[PDB]
Enzyme design. Structure first.
Site, PDB file in Angstrom:
ATOM      1  N   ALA A  43      14.458 -31.535  18.305  1.00 22.34           N
ATOM      2  CA  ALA A  43      15.636 -31.974  19.046  1.00 22.34           C
ATOM      3  C   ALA A  43      16.712 -30.899  18.958  1.00 22.34           C
ATOM      4  O   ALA A  43      16.797 -30.170  17.960  1.00 22.34           O
ATOM      5  CB  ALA A  43      16.155 -33.327  18.503  1.00 22.34           C
ATOM      6  N   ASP A  44      17.518 -30.792  20.015  1.00 21.32           N
ATOM      7  CA  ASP A  44      18.658 -29.891  20.047  1.00 21.32           C
ATOM      8  C   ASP A  44      19.756 -30.508  20.923  1.00 21.32           C
ATOM      9  O   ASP A  44      19.531 -30.782  22.090  1.00 21.32           O
ATOM     10  CB  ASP A  44      18.254 -28.489  20.545  1.00 21.32           C
ATOM     11  CG  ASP A  44      19.398 -27.472  20.433  1.00 21.32           C
ATOM     12  OD1 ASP A  44      19.871 -27.236  19.311  1.00 21.32           O
ATOM     13  OD2 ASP A  44      19.827 -26.897  21.464  1.00 21.32           O
ATOM     14  N   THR A  45      20.927 -30.735  20.322  1.00 25.93           N
ATOM     15  CA  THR A  45      22.097 -31.348  20.962  1.00 25.93           C
ATOM     16  C   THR A  45      23.141 -30.270  21.198  1.00 25.93           C
ATOM     17  O   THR A  45      23.491 -29.538  20.277  1.00 25.93           O
ATOM     18  CB  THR A  45      22.699 -32.457  20.057  1.00 25.93           C
ATOM     19  OG1 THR A  45      21.693 -33.417  19.728  1.00 25.93           O
ATOM     20  CG2 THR A  45      23.893 -33.184  20.716  1.00 25.93           C
TER      21      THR A  45
END
Length: 204
Positions: free
Chosen positions: A78-80
């Site tokens: 995941a990458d926000t």
């Protein structure tokens, strides 16, 4: 995913908390992927977020397999990121970075994107075969008009530090955030409902 070995390739307590609360059993193996890609190389910020999540998950998948010759069943990356007026904001480097980010965000609507990579792995012929499923979620967030005093108040708390764009919606970040529009769990760090829909696609 019940009886599969699931690896969350993320040290984020907030992501872990979300997946645990949803009943998922997983081991935490943070990525060593430290290259950050060229933002300009992507048509969209979510393209950037997904590729980044894919690379972190693939780094972990291969590293685990190389280590003990065990293909982990599923590896989640995941990458926000935050985007505002076309600029991508990630985590603040220091408190002064944090202030600049929040000034930028003040009185405006911005987007939060979380890109997610679900990597299914198996071993055949002395190598790791990986199958990657990629998705993202976008949530729009509105900041009220922040004063110099509140800005520094929030910065000094330390809350900005582990967060995309240097804020959270949950605690004293509540004094900054006027409204959220879409999936709130996505802003916290993980688009849970979208993930669950993705698992349905992949298994059915």
């Amino acid at each position: 995913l019940l009886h599969k070995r699931v690896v969350l390739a993320s040290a984020s307590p907030r992501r872990q908390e979300i997946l645990s609360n949803a009943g998922l059993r997983f081991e935490v193996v943070p990525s060593k992927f430290k290259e950050k890609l060229d933002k300009a190389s992507f048509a969209t910020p979510y393209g950037y977020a997904m590729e980044t999540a894919k690379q972190k998950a693939l780094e972990v998948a291969n590293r685990l397999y190389q280590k003990d010759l065990r293909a982990p069943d599923v590896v989640i990356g995941a990458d926000t990121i935050v985007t505002v007026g076309g600029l991508i904001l990630e985590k603040p480097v220091d408190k002064q970075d944090a202030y600049r980010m929040l000034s930028r965000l003040s009185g405006r609507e911005h987007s939060v994107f979380t890109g997610v990579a679900i990597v299914h792995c198996s071993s055949k012929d002395h190598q790791l075969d990986t199958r990657v499923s990629e998705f993202y979620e976008e949530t729009k967030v509105k900041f009220s008009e922040l004063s110099e005093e509140l800005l520094w108040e929030y910065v000094h708390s330390g809350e900005p530090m582990d967060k995309a764009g240097g804020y959270g919606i949950q605690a004293l970040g509540g004094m900054l955030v006027e409204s959220v529009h879409g999936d709130f769990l996505n802003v916290v760090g993980f688009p849970l409902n979208h993930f669950c829909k993705q698992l349905v696609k992949l298994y059915y």
